[PDB]
């Protein structure tokens, strides 16, 4: 994304849809990139604090992770994915944000459609599918408002 301002993505978000290059990255509730974003917190240094939910050890756990700015705009590095990358594809800031993440990387990618509100946004999902046409995705999940308002989308 040309000209990302992370100061305009601060707030609460929902994981409306997910897609991955490998079925195993998302297939089960405990799959490793089956993560539900809840909050983006930009820091004055230009990093991104991310609150998310992940199902592990048979419960819905809260995680704080740090996404570090890099020399490539809209690209961040995560400690928690073995210094592998988050790529922001697109955002209108006010409604949706499309990102991809490398599995803990060259070879496996999971992407999500984030929305500010727990509602189905077909405009957001259209842009998501448009930007995925390029990518070899083999699994796609779309979630309903009940899931979005739940804990770990259940």
**Which residues contribute to the site for ligand DE1 (CB under 6 A)?**
18, 33, 35, 37, 40, 48, 50, 52, 65, 67, 78, 80-81, 86, 88, 99, 101, 110, 112
Contacted by 109, from ligand DE1, its own copies, none: CB < 5 to 8 Å by type: none
Q: Pick the stretch among 23-31, 50-58, 60-68, 86-94 that binds its own copies (CB under 8 A).
A: 23-31
Nearer to its own copies, 25 or 74 (CB): 25
Hey, which residues does 57 pair with through a beta bridge?
Answer: none
Contacted by 142, from ligand DE1, its own copies, none: CB < 5 to 8 Å by type: its own copies
Give the contacts of 95 (CB within 8 A, at least 6 positions apart).
115, 116, 117, 121, 123, 124
How many residues interact with its own copies (rule CB under 8 A)? 13
Nearer to its own copies, 69 or 140 (CB): 140
Q: How far is Cα of residue 146 from the mean position of the Cα atoms in its chain?
A: 19
Question: Looking only at residues 79 through 138 of this chain, which bind its own copies when binding is defined by CB under 8 A?
Answer: 137-138
What whole-number distance in Å separates Cα of residue 78 and Cα of residue 123?
29
Do the Cβ atoms of 114 and 95 come closer than 8 Å?
A: no
Among 93, 125, 140, 152, binds its own copies (CB under 8 A): 140
Nearest residue to 146 via CA among 118, 117, 124? 118
What whole-number distance in Å separates Cα of residue 112 and Cα of residue 143?
11
Chain residues in the site for its own copies (CB under 8 A): 23, 26-29, 137-144
């Amino acid at each position: 994304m040309k000209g990302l301002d992370i100061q305009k993505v601060a707030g609460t978000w929902y994981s409306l849809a997910m897609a991955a290059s490998d079925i195993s990255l998302l297939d089960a509730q405990s799959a490793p990139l089956r993560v539900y974003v809840e909050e983006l917190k930009p820091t004055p240094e230009g990093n991104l604090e991310i609150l998310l939910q992940k199902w592990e050890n048979g419960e819905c756990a809260q995680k704080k992770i740090i996404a570090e700015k890099t020399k490539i705009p809209a690209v961040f590095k995560i400690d928690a994915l073995n210094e592998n990358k988050v790529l922001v594809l697109d955002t209108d800031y006010k409604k949706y944000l499309l990102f991809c993440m490398e599995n803990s990387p060259e070879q496996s990618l999971a992407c999500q459609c984030l929305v500010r509100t727990p509602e189905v946004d077909n405009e957001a999902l259209e842009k998501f599918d448009k930007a995925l046409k390029a990518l070899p995705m083999h699994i796609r999940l779309a979630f309903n408002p009940t899931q979005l308002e739940g804990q770990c989308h259940v």
